[PDB]
Amino acid sequence: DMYIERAGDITWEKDAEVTGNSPRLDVALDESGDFSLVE
């Protein structure tokens, strides 16, 4: 059986670490809700 535990408030933080790129990807979404790369 699963349970929930509070982890924090939903707020934007001014001193957050900034990282990650912004790729443009062609993808397909199947009936099981899974994404796959299409090239």
Binding site: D1, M2, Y3, I4, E5, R6, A7, G8, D9, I10, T11, W12, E13, A16, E17, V18, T19, G20, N21, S22, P23, R24, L25, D26, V27, A28, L29, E31, S32, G33, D34, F35, S36, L37
Partner: protein, 156 residues
């Protein structure tokens, strides 16, 4: 039990010890998570019980205690924050500029951040603190890195 708004961990005692299978968002008395995290199962909140109210495997979303409440959307221009809640670690905000998933049914924002699978369900926020989607349904690229859709539901 705990109905206060905020970000929550989703835990199980089925596997070894206590394991974090995912994350969710409590807002307006409704718990919002990704379908692959709970597979539609009931949740416990202290001594209280959360029952699924709505869900869709193709959207990979599920709501508890009421209908989907999160209606904000990425503007397609500005940076956002992943409020990452990794297993056994403190909630941490990470700022990024989303990329794009181009599909035959239209375009969706995507965040290129690598976190363990138990981070699925962590909310993605706009500059006003509104939840524009959940992190955790996406694709693995070239070296094993992860890129997640910004997955959002519809508020009726």
């Amino acid at each position: 039990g705990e109905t206060t708004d905020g970000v929550y961990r989703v835990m199980t005692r089925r596997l070894l010890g206590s394991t974090q299978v995912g994350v969710g968002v409590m807002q307006e008395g409704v718990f919002h998570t990704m379908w692959h995290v709970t597979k539609g199962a009931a949740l416990r909140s202290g001594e209280g019980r959360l029952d699924p109210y709505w869900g869709d495997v193709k959207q990979d979303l599920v709501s508890y205690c009421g209908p989907w409440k999160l209606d904000a959307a990425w503007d397609g221009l500005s940076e956002v924050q992943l409020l990452a809640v990794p297993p056994g670690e403190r909630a941490k905000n990470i700022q990024t500029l989303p990329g794009i998933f181009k599909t035959k049914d239209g375009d969706i924002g995507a965040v290129a951040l690598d976190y363990p699978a138990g981070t699925s369900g962590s909310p993605i926020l706009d500059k006003c603190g509104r939840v524009i989607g959940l992190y955790g349904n996406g694709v693995v690229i070239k070296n094993g890195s992860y890129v997640s859709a910004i997955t959002q539901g519809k508020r009726e």
